Symmetry: D2
Subunit: 245 residues, 4 copies
């Protein structure tokens, strides 16, 4: 019973107002965690917390563009204050997406994706390291993507930033193991989110369907539990078999 619980744990989830992030918030709360989340949109963030606070859920938030270093430093300080410098769980879920042929990418496109997909997760880990160490039971989960192992038209820079994230998972896993912190990455296939609302792909999925947000969030919760205590440095695809055909 204790191996499969997150009771007494504190968690930060970037980009919890919609999509996968929102499902991760609810899954973690469902298992006993206290969650701090963020978004760039005050109104929806605000709405999201009212809902959760109606429902018994200890969720806290503030507006953060995790594409801003200054903002990131800001988020980390507030998180540290709320949780008194102890954090069990960091989920780097917030990201960005640009779909263009390689010829079409601009300098702004490139810096945009690198900042929100790679530099964001990296610096937040740096910022959260003291608090994760203080937890004595740290878990970092990055939301990667399955296209970091295959070539999908238009995904070049986006997949490259996600492939950098997968490697960073390895380095975090080994460097911070001595602080009892585990790091893993979840690589989703196509998931129905507000991000993706914005036949060819599904024809390539053996299950013949796109993913649901809870099919990703459930593994995010699992990787944070005591039952996952020997799983670290892994990249796990949640794609209905999409990458292997």
């Amino acid at each position: 019973e204790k191996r499969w619980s997150l009771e007494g744990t504190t968690a930060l989830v970037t980009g919890g107002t919609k999509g996968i992030g929102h499902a991760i918030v609810e899954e973690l709360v469902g298992f006993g965690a206290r969650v701090y989340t963020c978004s760039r949109n005050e109104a929806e963030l605000r709405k999201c917390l009212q809902e959760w606070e109606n429902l018994k859920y200890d969720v806290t938030g503030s507006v953060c563009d995790v594409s801003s270093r200054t903002e990131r430093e800001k988020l980390a300080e507030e998180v540290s204050s709320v949780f008194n410098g102890k954090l069990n769980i960091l989920i780097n879920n917030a990201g960005g997406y640009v779909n263009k042929p390689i010829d079409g990418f601009t300098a702004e496109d490139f810096s945009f994706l690198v900042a929100v997909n790679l530099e964001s997760a990296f610096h937040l880990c740096q910022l959260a390291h003291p608090m994760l160490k203080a937890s004595g039971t740290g878990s970092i989960v990055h939301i990667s993507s399955c296209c970091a192992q295959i070539a999908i038209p238009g995904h070049s820079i986006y997949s490259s930033t996600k492939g950098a994230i997968n490697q960073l998972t390895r380095n975090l896993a080994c460097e911070w193991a001595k602080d009892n912190i585990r790091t893993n990455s979840i690589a989703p296939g196509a998931i129905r989110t507000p991000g993706t609302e914005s036949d060819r792909e599904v024809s390539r999925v053996p299950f013949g369907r796109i993913g649901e947000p809870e099919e990703v969030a459930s593994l995010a919760a699992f990787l944070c539990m005591p039952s996952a205590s020997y799983i670290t440095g892994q990249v796990i695809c949640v794609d209905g078999g999409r990458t292997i055909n």
Copy 2:
């Protein structure tokens, strides 16, 4: 949340369930509400296990089977079908065999043994279980592979090769049987505590060598493999198929 993280009402077969990882898997599955069938080659051991599991009112049945034998695998599948009335939700291929020798030392008998017990047993049991898994409407196959199928550990050549074969077979199974709502995945453990016996002396120098290469600096416990096997069989793993997941404390990526 409660429906997607439960195995209530499911049926499972776990090969080699008397000790170690296999034993932890059986009890993890029962813990989440499955009815479990298990086997072993040692009858005496198996009976004791069976007699015990009752008294903690766990729903576990079993029979003696050497999974390296084709005819014994067939008889196992028929008894499992009879016990579960032709409906199997879960197949855990955990039984295997280990021999460690320099490449030059392996004989024809070694090669035959390792391939039969590690690769053919899992392949043939998948074929035999396919009708039951399909009749269940929601199937989950988990192979217990090994993280040494991605790196070279001294003495592991044929053993690791059979596990690399299992990892590939996982992908073929995931794609071919998805249409039957069957998922197939592989768990690749690293160094896991070996259950002791009254008569075998464990090589502690070999154990220390592998544990020294784990970032975590410790050996894994059987429950740390069993937990992921149960999760992979839950409704909550519905979009996870064809994967090989290392449970090794960072062993394979530790440079």
Copy 3:
């Protein structure tokens, strides 16, 4: 040292299994083209004698004997004959001979399984064991296994075939690490679909051909010399720091999405 030395197989000896057609025949000719003395085999005496007669008329140094590499006694014999011809020194072992059965998983019999394991995996494993003294005595050894790119993806009908080739990919890593001390390197080449006599029935099957070719970014199947060139390169002194790798020769097939 020099570029000309590092890109040459002058003075080497090599064994290529299954050299009478397809990829194996292209490898025999590629290795001869760079100066190697080659030994080869197949199961068919008439075809092998014909190849050997052609290679003499080309003044290529190729020797051969009949060998079914799925048989343990035949492999032992082959290794004794090779060691006699090359005076116990072998620079290069190319495990090219293989076999193929295409069925749904439910369809495979015990004989199908045994056939594929013996010719794709046990043949290579045992021939590496038998060749080890000669590879070490050459002072510079190179083992190349011909695997398959479908040991990383699921192709319908390929379950046992791909699994035996995945076993080869792992064995490559063990051989690379255990025998580095003997100055032997081991690598695997993993082709996508290649035009060979082995695939001729596939190529005639126009629906099966378009299905596979639609998945290759290059829009075509490969040719035997596109595999053989890399087999030759992996055996040269220029490949001195390349060991334990699995290299796909597949026109982008496996990473295409």
Copy 4:
């Protein structure tokens, strides 16, 4: 014919960071097979000495000073190469890179921005600028120099390895999107190689030694030859077995 497939006669090539280490070996390897090479470096003095060395050995090497971490210098570099080679480039070798060895905690914003610019955005933007001449050559070959540590965790390598992992993924996207233009793209992932950039690591190499620059340059040249015509999208480690040694 064999002799035709194993050869780079008449090809044109750009190799970034050709004044030392692997890049220097790649320049000489490519010239050795008949290529005409354009290369570059941030250091004018050493670029001069290299160009003068190669001039005195009658190699066809041209060079200009360029910092590939700067967007504008990349565009200037691309236009000079198009002019020298009359708009046709057979070969692009993205070798120039940077290294910063620190624990994850120590990396600064400049360090991160530094490594991404020189290891990732450098190659990516240069690929776009080189695309018309590579297409115009009718036979294009892009080779990135990545690193074998993009598959394992080596202490101090966290950001460096991540940029090389991004390179490895970018190779796959390039290989698939530009196969239609008869351009192939592959990555070489060296282990420890004896260079000016460079017992704990050697004890983990099965061969028990670091590599030589020509042991990387050999493969770079092979991947540009017609013999490599069906090889694209691959990441090939040149590491003496280091990544697989357990």
